[PDB]
PDB file of C-alpha atoms in Angstrom:
ATOM      1  CA  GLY A   1    -201.859  30.681 -71.502  1.00  0.00           C
ATOM      2  CA  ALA A   2    -204.733  29.307 -73.568  1.00  0.00           C
ATOM      3  CA  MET A   3    -207.087  32.226 -74.202  1.00  0.00           C
ATOM      4  CA  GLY A   4    -209.057  31.527 -77.365  1.00  0.00           C
ATOM      5  CA  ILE A   5    -208.606  29.672 -80.645  1.00  0.00           C
ATOM      6  CA  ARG A   6    -210.593  29.503 -83.884  1.00  0.00           C
ATOM      7  CA  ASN A   7    -210.554  27.611 -87.184  1.00  0.00           C
ATOM      8  CA  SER A   8    -211.346  27.907 -90.894  1.00  0.00           C
ATOM      9  CA  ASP A   9    -212.608  25.838 -93.824  1.00  0.00           C
ATOM     10  CA  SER A  10    -211.851  25.038 -97.466  1.00  0.00           C
ATOM     11  CA  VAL A  11    -213.460  23.541-100.570  1.00  0.00           C
ATOM     12  CA  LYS A  12    -212.230  20.325-102.187  1.00  0.00           C
ATOM     13  CA  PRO A  13    -213.688  20.146-105.721  1.00  0.00           C
ATOM     14  CA  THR A  14    -212.808  17.624-108.429  1.00  0.00           C
ATOM     15  CA  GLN A  15    -210.608  18.684-111.344  1.00  0.00           C
ATOM     16  CA  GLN A  16    -207.367  17.916-113.182  1.00  0.00           C
ATOM     17  CA  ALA A  17    -205.188  19.601-110.561  1.00  0.00           C
ATOM     18  CA  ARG A  18    -204.725  16.705-108.139  1.00  0.00           C
ATOM     19  CA  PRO A  19    -204.958  17.661-104.439  1.00  0.00           C
ATOM     20  CA  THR A  20    -201.712  17.797-102.463  1.00  0.00           C
ATOM     21  CA  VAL A  21    -201.876  16.111 -99.057  1.00  0.00           C
ATOM     22  CA  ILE A  22    -199.205  16.566 -96.390  1.00  0.00           C
ATOM     23  CA  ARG A  23    -198.819  14.758 -93.066  1.00  0.00           C
ATOM     24  CA  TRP A  24    -197.268  16.264 -89.936  1.00  0.00           C
ATOM     25  CA  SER A  25    -195.709  14.519 -86.937  1.00  0.00           C
ATOM     26  CA  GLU A  26    -194.815  16.198 -83.643  1.00  0.00           C
ATOM     27  CA  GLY A  27    -197.736  16.250 -81.225  1.00  0.00           C
ATOM     28  CA  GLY A  28    -198.793  19.884 -81.231  1.00  0.00           C
ATOM     29  CA  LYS A  29    -202.174  21.449 -80.496  1.00  0.00           C
ATOM     30  CA  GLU A  30    -202.421  23.994 -83.312  1.00  0.00           C
ATOM     31  CA  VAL A  31    -200.717  23.291 -86.640  1.00  0.00           C
ATOM     32  CA  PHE A  32    -200.865  25.215 -89.916  1.00  0.00           C
ATOM     33  CA  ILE A  33    -199.291  25.247 -93.379  1.00  0.00           C
ATOM     34  CA  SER A  34    -198.182  28.016 -95.737  1.00  0.00           C
ATOM     35  CA  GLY A  35    -196.233  28.134 -98.987  1.00  0.00           C
ATOM     36  CA  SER A  36    -195.936  29.585-102.483  1.00  0.00           C
ATOM     37  CA  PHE A  37    -199.189  27.767-103.247  1.00  0.00           C
ATOM     38  CA  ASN A  38    -201.027  30.348-101.142  1.00  0.00           C
ATOM     39  CA  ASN A  39    -198.669  33.280-101.698  1.00  0.00           C
ATOM     40  CA  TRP A  40    -197.713  32.841 -98.043  1.00  0.00           C
ATOM     41  CA  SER A  41    -200.688  35.086 -97.285  1.00  0.00           C
ATOM     42  CA  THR A  42    -202.418  33.235 -94.448  1.00  0.00           C
ATOM     43  CA  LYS A  43    -201.833  30.020 -92.503  1.00  0.00           C
ATOM     44  CA  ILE A  44    -204.181  27.188 -93.470  1.00  0.00           C
ATOM     45  CA  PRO A  45    -205.241  24.991 -90.522  1.00  0.00           C
ATOM     46  CA  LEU A  46    -204.015  21.392 -90.659  1.00  0.00           C
ATOM     47  CA  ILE A  47    -206.921  18.968 -90.291  1.00  0.00           C
ATOM     48  CA  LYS A  48    -206.203  17.038 -87.094  1.00  0.00           C
ATOM     49  CA  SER A  49    -206.663  13.298 -87.615  1.00  0.00           C
ATOM     50  CA  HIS A  50    -206.923  10.389 -85.178  1.00  0.00           C
ATOM     51  CA  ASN A  51    -203.246   9.581 -85.722  1.00  0.00           C
ATOM     52  CA  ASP A  52    -201.653  12.917 -86.618  1.00  0.00           C
ATOM     53  CA  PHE A  53    -202.191  16.231 -88.404  1.00  0.00           C
ATOM     54  CA  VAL A  54    -202.899  16.332 -92.140  1.00  0.00           C
ATOM     55  CA  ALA A  55    -203.808  18.978 -94.715  1.00  0.00           C
ATOM     56  CA  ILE A  56    -205.162  18.517 -98.238  1.00  0.00           C
ATOM     57  CA  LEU A  57    -204.413  21.488-100.490  1.00  0.00           C
ATOM     58  CA  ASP A  58    -205.254  22.040-104.158  1.00  0.00           C
ATOM     59  CA  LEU A  59    -202.145  22.221-106.342  1.00  0.00           C
ATOM     60  CA  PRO A  60    -201.778  21.990-110.144  1.00  0.00           C
ATOM     61  CA  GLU A  61    -198.728  19.887-111.011  1.00  0.00           C
ATOM     62  CA  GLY A  62    -194.980  20.393-110.736  1.00  0.00           C
ATOM     63  CA  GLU A  63    -193.176  21.848-107.729  1.00  0.00           C
ATOM     64  CA  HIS A  64    -194.313  24.048-104.857  1.00  0.00           C
ATOM     65  CA  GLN A  65    -192.827  25.295-101.594  1.00  0.00           C
ATOM     66  CA  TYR A  66    -194.363  25.112 -98.119  1.00  0.00           C
ATOM     67  CA  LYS A  67    -193.630  25.363 -94.395  1.00  0.00           C
ATOM     68  CA  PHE A  68    -195.108  23.957 -91.184  1.00  0.00           C
ATOM     69  CA  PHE A  69    -196.411  26.200 -88.403  1.00  0.00           C
ATOM     70  CA  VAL A  70    -196.667  24.807 -84.873  1.00  0.00           C
ATOM     71  CA  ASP A  71    -197.163  26.856 -81.708  1.00  0.00           C
ATOM     72  CA  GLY A  72    -196.434  30.019 -83.670  1.00  0.00           C
ATOM     73  CA  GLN A  73    -193.027  28.534 -84.440  1.00  0.00           C
ATOM     74  CA  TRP A  74    -191.347  27.364 -87.645  1.00  0.00           C
ATOM     75  CA  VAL A  75    -190.432  23.681 -87.905  1.00  0.00           C
ATOM     76  CA  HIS A  76    -189.489  21.144 -90.577  1.00  0.00           C
ATOM     77  CA  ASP A  77    -190.358  17.473 -91.063  1.00  0.00           C
ATOM     78  CA  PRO A  78    -187.544  14.881 -90.952  1.00  0.00           C
ATOM     79  CA  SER A  79    -189.622  12.562 -93.136  1.00  0.00           C
ATOM     80  CA  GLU A  80    -190.097  15.177 -95.857  1.00  0.00           C
ATOM     81  CA  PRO A  81    -187.466  17.029 -97.928  1.00  0.00           C
ATOM     82  CA  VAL A  82    -186.176  20.358 -96.616  1.00  0.00           C
ATOM     83  CA  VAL A  83    -184.679  23.299 -98.506  1.00  0.00           C
ATOM     84  CA  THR A  84    -182.551  26.320 -97.607  1.00  0.00           C
ATOM     85  CA  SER A  85    -183.821  29.870 -98.112  1.00  0.00           C
ATOM     86  CA  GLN A  86    -181.684  32.934 -98.827  1.00  0.00           C
ATOM     87  CA  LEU A  87    -181.926  33.871 -95.149  1.00  0.00           C
ATOM     88  CA  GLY A  88    -180.353  30.593 -94.072  1.00  0.00           C
ATOM     89  CA  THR A  89    -183.813  29.487 -92.969  1.00  0.00           C
ATOM     90  CA  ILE A  90    -184.833  25.848 -93.379  1.00  0.00           C
ATOM     91  CA  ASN A  91    -187.942  25.262 -95.489  1.00  0.00           C
ATOM     92  CA  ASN A  92    -189.960  22.426 -97.024  1.00  0.00           C
ATOM     93  CA  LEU A  93    -190.416  21.437-100.670  1.00  0.00           C
ATOM     94  CA  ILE A  94    -193.347  19.536-102.170  1.00  0.00           C
ATOM     95  CA  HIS A  95    -193.947  18.102-105.642  1.00  0.00           C
ATOM     96  CA  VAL A  96    -197.197  17.248-107.426  1.00  0.00           C
ATOM     97  CA  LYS A  97    -197.622  14.745-110.258  1.00  0.00           C
ATOM     98  CA  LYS A  98    -200.470  14.786-112.779  1.00  0.00           C
ATOM     99  CA  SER A  99    -202.387  11.748-111.526  1.00  0.00           C
ATOM    100  CA  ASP A 100    -205.726  12.910-112.928  1.00  0.00           C
ATOM    101  CA  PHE A 101    -204.292  12.411-116.415  1.00  0.00           C
ATOM    102  CA  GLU A 102    -202.967   8.875-115.951  1.00  0.00           C
ATOM    103  CA  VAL A 103    -205.922   7.927-113.750  1.00  0.00           C
ATOM    104  CA  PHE A 104    -209.419   7.847-115.240  1.00  0.00           C
ATOM    105  CA  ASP A 105    -211.169   7.776-111.864  1.00  0.00           C
TER     106      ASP A 105
END
């Protein structure tokens, strides 16, 4: 039952906080991402590539949580690390390293 679907946008400036990119593999039509990096407020749309889905967020440096959203359903990636919430729900964990510091360009 495909009625109607929309999309959003996002800015990708250049600063110390290196951007966090995440790849998704499954073969879905609409994929999103949400974690502690966005206060789990809304679901950011995963930029669909020629190979698979990918999303480039803007994180500082350290450790942040996140979760995939496909077909209005929660799913985890076997290639990426998964965690366990207090509600026995499987989640995803992502880490960011200060590359802007070590790298000059």
